[PDB]
Amino acid sequence: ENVFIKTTSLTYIDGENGILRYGGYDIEDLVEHTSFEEVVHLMLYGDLPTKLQLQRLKSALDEAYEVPQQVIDMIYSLPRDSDAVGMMETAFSALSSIYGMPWNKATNRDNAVKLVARASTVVANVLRAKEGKKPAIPEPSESFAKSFLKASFSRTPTEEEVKAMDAALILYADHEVPASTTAALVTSSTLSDIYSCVVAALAALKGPLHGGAAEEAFKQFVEIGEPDMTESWFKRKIIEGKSRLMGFGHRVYKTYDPRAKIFKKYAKVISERNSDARKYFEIAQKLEELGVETFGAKHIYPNTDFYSGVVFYALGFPVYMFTSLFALSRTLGWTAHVIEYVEDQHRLIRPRALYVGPLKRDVVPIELR
Amino acid sequence: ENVFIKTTSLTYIDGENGILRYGGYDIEDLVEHTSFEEVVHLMLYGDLPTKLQLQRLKSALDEAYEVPQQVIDMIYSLPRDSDAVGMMETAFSALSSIYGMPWNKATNRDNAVKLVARASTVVANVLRAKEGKKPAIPEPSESFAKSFLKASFSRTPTEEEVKAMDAALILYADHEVPASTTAALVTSSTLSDIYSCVVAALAALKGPLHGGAAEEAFKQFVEIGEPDMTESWFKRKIIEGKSRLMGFGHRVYKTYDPRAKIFKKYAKVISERNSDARKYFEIAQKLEELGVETFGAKHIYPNTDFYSGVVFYALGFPVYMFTSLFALSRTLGWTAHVIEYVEDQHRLIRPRALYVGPLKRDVVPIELR
Ligand SMILES: CC(=O)SCCNC(=O)CCNC(=O)[C@H](O)C(C)(C)COP(=O)(O)OP(=O)(O)OC[C@H]1O[C@@H](n2cnc3c(N)ncnc32)[C@H](O)[C@@H]1OP(=O)(O)O
Ligand SMILES: CC(=O)SCCNC(=O)CCNC(=O)[C@H](O)C(C)(C)COP(=O)(O)OP(=O)(O)OC[C@H]1O[C@@H](n2cnc3c(N)ncnc32)[C@H](O)[C@@H]1OP(=O)(O)O
Known part of the structure; x- marks a missing residue:
């Protein structure tokens, strides 16, 4: 509170x-x-x-x-x-x-x-x-x-x-x-x-x-599978199904999370040298574009969890x-x-608990229960 | 609070x-x-x-x-x-x-x-x-x-x-x-x-x-060693040295802790059948008498930790x-x-931390530190 x-x-x-x-x-x-x-x-x-x-x-x-x-x-x-x-x-x-x-x-x-x-x-x-x-x-x-x-x-x-x-x-x-x-x-x-x-x-x-937040964000990319499928996934899951976009939004930051831009920078370099890692980076980048286009006016932007998985996977x-x-x-x-x-x-x-339970009562033998 | x-x-x-x-x-x-x-x-x-x-x-x-x-x-x-x-x-x-x-x-x-x-x-x-x-x-x-x-x-x-x-x-x-x-x-x-x-x-x-509270209370009895030594220990450590009596006192109970009377009851029975266990029960009982005589008027009485060790030891x-x-x-x-x-x-x-640390400062190369 x-x-x-x-x-x-x-x-x-x-x-x-x-x-x-x-x-x-x-x-x-x-x-x-x-x-x-x-x-x-x-x-x-x-x-x-x-x-x-x-x-x-x-x-x-x-x-x-x-x-x-x-x-x-x-x-x-x-x-x-x-x-x-x-x-x-x-x-x-x-x-x-x-x-x-x-x-x-x-x-x-x-x-x-x-x-x-x-x-x-x-x-x-x-x-x-x-x-x-x-x-x-x-x-x-x-x-x-x-x-x-x-x-x-x-x-x-x-x-x-x-x-x-x-x-x-x-x-x-x-x-x-x-x-x-x-x-x-x-x-x-x-x-x-x-x-x-x-x-x-x-x-x-x-x-x-x-x-599990970095996992949940990155699992979106895995489900998309190939960059040419991103728009369709975003149309179906986000626009029609109204799911939130994982790795977007933050309780404090009403801008891009400063960490997200840095994870992105580092993801680009090391992702390129493996075509699997590269594919996920390309899917993430396309989702980021779709997401900011759709939610940026609501002050919902990539958070630190959006690109961290891409870095870890590429590693x-x-x-x-x-x-x-x-x-x-x-x-x-x-x-x-x-x-x-x-x-x-x-x-x-040392916090306290307020008692809201039963008033005084007497134990009864099990046969009478 | x-x-x-x-x-x-x-x-x-x-x-x-x-x-x-x-x-x-x-x-x-x-x-x-x-x-x-x-x-x-x-x-x-x-x-x-x-x-x-x-x-x-x-x-x-x-x-x-x-x-x-x-x-x-x-x-x-x-x-x-x-x-x-x-x-x-x-x-x-x-x-x-x-x-x-x-x-x-x-x-x-x-x-x-x-x-x-x-x-x-x-x-x-x-x-x-x-x-x-x-x-x-x-x-x-x-x-x-x-x-x-x-x-x-x-x-x-x-x-x-x-x-x-x-x-x-x-x-x-x-x-x-x-x-x-x-x-x-x-x-x-x-x-x-x-x-x-x-x-x-x-x-x-x-x-x-x-x-460690049951251990700390019972360690008093171990240090005393024999029932005929209790008064001397109490004179030296409690009356002269002003140590608190461990297993006495409670933040809520201003009476005997209801648990302490029950641990006592059960300690008496099972302690008697081993002379080591019996010795500790006898030392605890003498300390309890000394302690209530000395601190009872201050609403300081045995707590649940005073006799639990005696029960566990006797077991x-x-x-x-x-x-x-x-x-x-x-x-x-x-x-x-x-x-x-x-x-x-x-x-x-989700509580918060109030920042009281340094204002904005620029990283300086290590040679300049
Ligand atoms: C630990 C775990 O694994 S769970 C982590 C997985 N979760 C995620 O990756 C998503 C993380 N982000 C969020 O859930 C949220 O953005 C929070 C909880 C961080 C902020 O949520 P809110 O408190 O609703 O933020 P806010 O009040 O700014 O929302 C404003 C609008 O943006 C929407 N919105 C908020 N976050 C998102 C998002 N990630 N995607 C799409 N829309 C969003 C809200 O529904 C609201 O819509 P409305 O105009 O229809 O009312
Ligand atoms: C987890 C661990 O191992 S640490 C557990 C080991 N500790 C113990 O066994 C002792 C447990 N009891 C206590 O420490 C205390 O009695 C508490 C902390 C439970 C209550 O302490 P206080 O908040 O001081 O209680 P209170 O305000 O009622 O004290 C009134 C007077 O009794 C004294 N007093 C309190 N507890 C004791 C005690 N156990 N022995 C002797 N005197 C005591 C106080 O010093 C005070 O003396 P004063 O008249 O000179 O001011």
């Missing part, structure tokens, strides 16, 4: 003007001129890092990728058709049991850095389990994005692929206070460890009113991974919000 | 008068004259069951105890010194991935019944893992309490032991809206499956501002299990609250 649950210095949103900033820096500026590691430092420490700061952060990520074999075994023992976010939830519960530490001002940010690394290991292994491939642990490389793509796919990505993944990680890092962030905050109020805060976030993200990720890829990115926003909350504004969360 | 998050028909509390009712039935009446299975039916369906209702409920519990071997393997692959609530969290995430189903009015309560059974299987196996014993799955018996104790300990409990466990399960089933229930509710708002609602609850319960549970035993019971209240919430009063949870 518009209820402000906390203050933040992390993320500024201007819905009327289409502006998204992390720590005062415009999202476009961050994507073009920084890197996910730099944005991790910005969200956790409040500024972009110096060379030496960046170096220490990178070494901390590198040493954190390795998790115990038992975590990997658990991922690989779930049914291969299980929801990927659910597999992440299970892996993060195990990480919580192994690594969880108490809240401590001096080490909270170091603990979050290690968790973000381990999110990379988990997501790469969730993909590989579902695909029936052998496990792989991310290894040091020139960047977090590159290490994640190499672990995921066992081939060296191109620079354009790396840059697209890096962008996606920045783009999805934080936004508003959705149910997943709220669950993390509630969990943090009892001083549950940071890994368990992420477990709760993932539990909420698994729900189909929160998770080699199946559709079943898209919300998990969101989660990979959003671990930064979850951890940064809970650290802000615990360090500044820790109230123990 | 006294903020009513929902209505409920489950649990009525009168703090001034020391009254606790489930569905209009006084807690004392339920413990004496019903059973945990009957209270499961009351919380989920709104009344105590008929014979035929009870029978169908019991068969549904019996068929639900068995879980896949992979869930058991996961419990047994965590470090044996891991927090027991964390092990539960991991097992419930795996159960969510295997069994999680969408919300459906016709089947929500059946899904909750099966989850409560599986909570029995999980908690029994968490104990057994930590103790380095072979797994055991609960099997049908005369009651849920008995099946749980037999799986836990591989011996047939006495009737008095059964009745104490049954009481404990009823006593802890629901109370107020603590952080664990709040996390469950947030998770349910996205329509995440009931098992993931419990995962979030357990994530919050792991935090030391919510979990054979180590101290490390006490919050997990709470959780076993409270799965009923968690599932019943989320079902009420989703079916009646489902609002998608």
Whole structure:
């Protein structure tokens, strides 16, 4: 009910003007001129890092990728058709049991850095389990994005692929206070460890009113199948059937979502080099044109979910991974919000329930019921 | 901030008068004259069951105890010194991935019944893992309490032991809206499956501002060691050191907590038959006398956590299990609250964060930082 649950210095949103900033820096500026590691430092420490700061952060990520074999075994023992976010939830519960530490001002940010690394290991292994491939642990490389793509796919990505993944990680890092962030905050109020805060976030993200938006948008393209079929699909499903166009519209943004233009940019480059990926990009682009022509006068435009799937697909990720890829990115926003909350504004969360149930009554023996 | 998050028909509390009712039935009446299975039916369906209702409920519990071997393997692959609530969290995430189903009015309560059974299987196996014993799955018996104790300990409990466990399960089933229930509710708002609602609850319960109260109260008795040492401990720690007496005091109850008198009753019976358990019961009883003599005029009295540990210890549970035993019971209240919430009063949870961070600034190249 518009209820402000906390203050933040992390993320500024201007819905009327289409502006998204992390720590005062415009999202476009961050994507073009920084890197996910730099944005991790910005969200956790409040500024972009110096060379030496960046170096220490990178070494901390590198040493954190390795998790115990038992975590990997658990991922690989779930049914291969299980929801990927659910597999992440299970892996993060195990990480919580192994690594969880108490809240401590001096080490909270170091603990979050290690968790973000381990999110990379988990997501790469969730993909590989579902695909029936052998496990792989991310290894040091020139960047977090590159290490994640190499672990995921066992081939060296191109620079354009790396840059697209890096962008996606920045783009999805934080936004508003959705149910997943709220669950993390509630969990943090009892001083549950940071890994368990992420477990709760993932539990909420698994729900189909929160998770699955990138999948639902991209599934439109899959159903269309070929670019020359787009107009007909749009005539039948949208114009005649009055379905909403998935990946259009936003509760805050009354303009294009600033993230959507950036996902689009990166989709174009990497989609062209595979004809399947190219086909989906061409279908999305035609739907975007039809959608803005039809709904732009109502202040309904592409949102961040419209082109993110196109990027992930072009990278080699199946559709079943898209919300998990969101989660990979959003671990930064979850951890940064809970650290802000615990360090500044820790109230123990204790709401009430109004009793509207039966008045006093006496137990009757079962034979008399 | 006294903020009513929902209505409920489950649990009525009168703090001034020391009254606790489930569905209009006084807690004392339920413990004496019903059973945990009957209270499961009351919380989920709104009344105590008929014979035929009870029978169908019991068969549904019996068929639900068995879980896949992979869930058991996961419990047994965590470090044996891991927090027991964390092990539960991991097992419930795996159960969510295997069994999680969408919300459906016709089947929500059946899904909750099966989850409560599986909570029995999980908690029994968490104990057994930590103790380095072979797994055991609960099997049908005369009651849920008995099946749980037999799986836990591989011996047939006495009737008095059964009745104490049954009481404990009823006593802890629901109370107020603590952080664990709040996390469950947030998770349910996205329509995440009931098992993931419990995962979030357990994530919050792991935090030391919510979990661990029965352990902290009972650890006082352990430190005292022998009944003839109680007065000295109380003189030193409480009178001179001004520590609070753990398991005394309550934010709502300004009288004895109605649950505390019932835990006491059941502790007396089963404690006498082992001299270690008897010693702790005698120490607790002497502390209670000292505590009420010292703090009763301030409306500070024993709470539900004071004697629950004594019951659990007398049953054979180590101290490390006490919050997990709470959780076993409270799965009923968690599932019943989320079902009420989703079916009646489902609002998608979307609070806001007020931005107080930096104004607009431009990215500077790393060399200039
Ligand atoms: C987690 C999941 O998987 S679910 C995610 C999948 N969903 C999507 O991809 C669609 C996302 N977008 C939306 O649902 C919405 O646009 C929200 C919910 C973001 C905004 O919806 P509203 O609150 O109705 O927005 P608003 O009040 O601006 O609507 C104005 C008009 O635009 C229409 N509209 C809103 N969104 C859309 C859309 N995506 N497509 C077509 N029309 C739309 C409304 O029906 C309304 O029409 P009217 O003139 O006949 O009244
Ligand atoms: C999850 C965990 O493991 S933490 C759980 C472990 N904690 C416990 O077992 C203790 C539980 N009880 C308490 O902490 C408290 O009694 C609450 C928090 C339940 C109530 O505390 P308050 O809000 O201070 O209650 P209240 O305002 O009634 O206090 C009145 C007086 O009684 C005192 N008091 C309150 N609880 C206790 C206690 N348990 N022992 C001794 N004195 C107490 C207060 O200090 C106050 O003293 P004063 O006259 O010098 O001001």
